[PDB]
């Protein structure tokens, strides 16, 4: 190939560092709450070349990948691919992201403590659930 | 409090077929299958014991062996004793603990604290 002048060697998206030199679909996977499959789905819904590296992009495209990523159901990523399906709180099929995941697992743990369930007590002990 | 974007008042007044859509899969399956005789009896008992109580006071505890029972929104408020093989555990049913079974409240085994080993 050639030498890209507008190359981002280091990326920062959603308070998580992304390695720009890595391949796009496997570079988004670096953030929490996004696996490979999901990334692929996003990038096929974003209409972006999959052969491209993460630093080998414009900003608008990146912003639109972000947009799609945030609000998956609106961009026709259908209701099974999402991380959290029926939430115990609001019951919204929404995919969770980087910090959100940390918040929400924590929340779950708290609720399981509160309830005094068996799983909860196991988790409090420092033991196995399954 | 809110459960799947639905409040307690709505939940209580809700259809039985509509809960077969607002639960986890297991629970939905169970409700499709139908509540067994014993379960029905338990539920009726609960209904009685919450009805025959002073308004200020917490209702009288109903003892049961059914740990295969799913907690419905109608049980929220009641105190239930659940057998764990040896002893009962008096459990106040909270709004948070509907999508669970009664079993996961009364633990059937004591947790392990290790004694120092012998001739091995």
């Amino acid at each position: 190939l050639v030498i890209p002048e507008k190359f981002q060697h280091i990326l920062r998206v959603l308070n998580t560092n992304i390695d720009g030199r890595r391949k796009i679909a496997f570079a988004i996977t670096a953030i929490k709450g996004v696996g490979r499959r999901y990334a692929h789905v996003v990038l096929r819904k974003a209409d972006i070349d999959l052969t491209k590296r993460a630093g080998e992009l414009t900003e608008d495209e990146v912003e639109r990948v972000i947009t799609i990523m945030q609000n998956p159901r609106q961009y026709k990523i259908p209701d099974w691919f999402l991380n959290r399906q029926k939430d115990v709180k609001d019951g919204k099929y929404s995919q969770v992201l980087a910090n959100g995941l940390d918040n929400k697992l924590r929340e779950d743990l708290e609720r399981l403590k509160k309830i005094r369930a068996h799983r909860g007590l196991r988790h409090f002990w420092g033991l196995r659930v399954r | 409090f809110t459960y799947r974007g639905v409040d307690l008042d709505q939940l209580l007044d809700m259809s039985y077929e509509q809960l077969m859509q607002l639960y986890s899969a297991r629970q939905r399956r169970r409700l499709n299958r139908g509540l067994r005789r014993k379960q029905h009896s338990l539920l009726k008992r609960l209904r009685k014991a919450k009805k025959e109580a002073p308004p200020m006071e917490k209702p009288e505890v109903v003892k049961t062996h059914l740990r295969d029972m799913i907690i419905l929104p109608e049980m929220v408020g009641s105190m239930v004793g659940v057998y764990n093989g040896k002893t009962f555990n008096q459990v106040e049913i909270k709004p948070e603990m509907i999508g669970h079974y009664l079993g996961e409240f009364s633990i059937t085994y004591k947790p392990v604290k290790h004694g120092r080993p012998g001739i091995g």
Binding site: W125 | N84, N89, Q90, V91, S106
Partner: peptide, 14 residues
Amino acid sequence: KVPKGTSSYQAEWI
């Protein structure tokens, strides 16, 4: 410190 209704058997978990 133990909750109101819980028994001696389940107390070991708390």
